Structure 1
């Protein structure tokens, strides 16, 4: 039972303009290099892929990224098939979900299906953020510490999360990796916001380096590794029985 699918196979050179919006600048690790990105110069649909490019164009770092204007209810599973063309040191690709119409981050939560950093290059990270975990200042969230440490992100993999009232279940390649569970605390504690808001889909290949002279988690950008691309074959949202 398919609620939403984009196979990026439309007769169009950009992703569906009603569904997908270009990521915009903000002063954070994932967003800083959307600044001065001219329209779709780092985003295209080609040969059945959404291709998100990270590059340096005349000394300016530029990220490739879109987010969905639509969001999805609980009782659903998101599956995203993607690969990186190349390992890029300082590269910071991600597949993730934000609440639509939540209060300020992280009070509505955040679900990361995939993040990659050079600091652990044979891994991907799957992570959850809430106000209960992060409070006002925290950014680490709760990550799968037992994540696969012999993993090649440059091959096609299906990254997935199943979201119910009870829990988030993470998968890689159809194999359960971990669960983040509803603790059923007073809603006041903001421990499990994941079913109060529709959640969207965010697909990006960002660049790290320093943010206001502090080294970001993805670490030092090696310009010799650029350009790089994340190729998304498809995204789908399945409605559970």
Structure 2
């Protein structure tokens, strides 16, 4: 419903303004990522089945130049925020550490596969005041591992949820790295894989928050949900590998 078909590349007049190359093995860098544990006791949205474990290397660890977000079948019943979940996973975001208004975002990633796995790379507005989905949301990459070659790119607004999205295919996305990218300006968003936009969403320039809520900063989110849109017990453990995040601006 938001088709695109054009090349995408880091413009020559843009600079790298922030990156996690994941050069440093161990815990993610607390200056760049926080853990989101906020709905662990209550259960996450979308009828999701995962517990998101914070400072737990079995779920979130930097290893051989990659962020590793790993889902496991275990019950983390010793955690004070445990919510009876049958699976653990990771969710990191830049919320309250780094956000961006416009930019070329590049995430190079090998995905987490298995029926139930729902790896994502997505953004939400730092200003949450208008609520969901009015605040505006950008899914650079969504995949559901019962359809594991298909890459989804979508935006969420008050007027559109009407959802504006598109899809493409990539070669063994869980067994090789691709670059999932967003090119966001005041005029439009492209979302692509490997230098090709398969998704285009234009600003109608009508100054209407319901249709263009993207004249304000967004933060970035990395996670593997389990269930919802994504359960094969044999598929665990499974992991998303992020080689780098790079953000460029004029």
TM-score normalised by structure 2 residue count = 0.81
Q: What does 1:106-145 correspond to in 2, within 5 Å? A: 106-134=133-161, 141-144=163-166
**8 Å contact 1:30–1:207 — kept in the other structure?**
no
Determine whether 1:236 maps to 2:246: yes
Q: What does 1:42-121 correspond to in 2, within 5 Å? A: 42-58=59-75, 60-68=86-94, 69-74=97-102, 76-84=103-111, 87-103=113-129, 104-121=131-148
Question: Residues 176-229 of structure 1: CA distance to partner in whole angstroms, max 9, x if unpaired?
Answer: 212101112342x5101112x211111111211xxxxxxx221xx111110000
Distance 1:107 1:32 in 2: 26
TM-score normalised by structure 1 residue count = 0.84
**8 Å contact 2:114–2:146 — kept in the other structure?**
no
Question: Deviation of residue 38 (structure 1)?
Answer: 5.1
Match of 2:195 in 1: 174
Question: Deviation of residue 120 (structure 1)?
Answer: 2.4
Long gaps (5+) in structure 2: 1-14, 76-84
Question: Residues 79-112 of structure 1: CA distance to partner in whole angstroms, max 9, x if unpaired?
Answer: 000002x521100000111111232121121000
**8 Å contact 1:124–1:151 — kept in the other structure?**
no
Distance 1:167 1:30 in 2: 32
Long gaps (5+) in structure 1: 135-139, 209-215
**8 Å contact 2:165–2:199 — kept in the other structure?**
no
Higher helix share: 1
**8 Å contact 2:49–2:87 — kept in the other structure?**
no
Match of 1:227 in 2: 237
Root-mean-square deviation (CA, aligned residues, Å) is 2.0
Question: Deviation of residue 25 (structure 1)?
Answer: 4.2
Distance 2:90 2:22 in 1: 16
Compared CA separation, residues 22 and 133, structure 1 to 2 (3 A):
same
Paired residues in the alignment total 218
SS at match of 1:224: helix
Question: Deviation of residue 61 (structure 1)?
Answer: 0.8
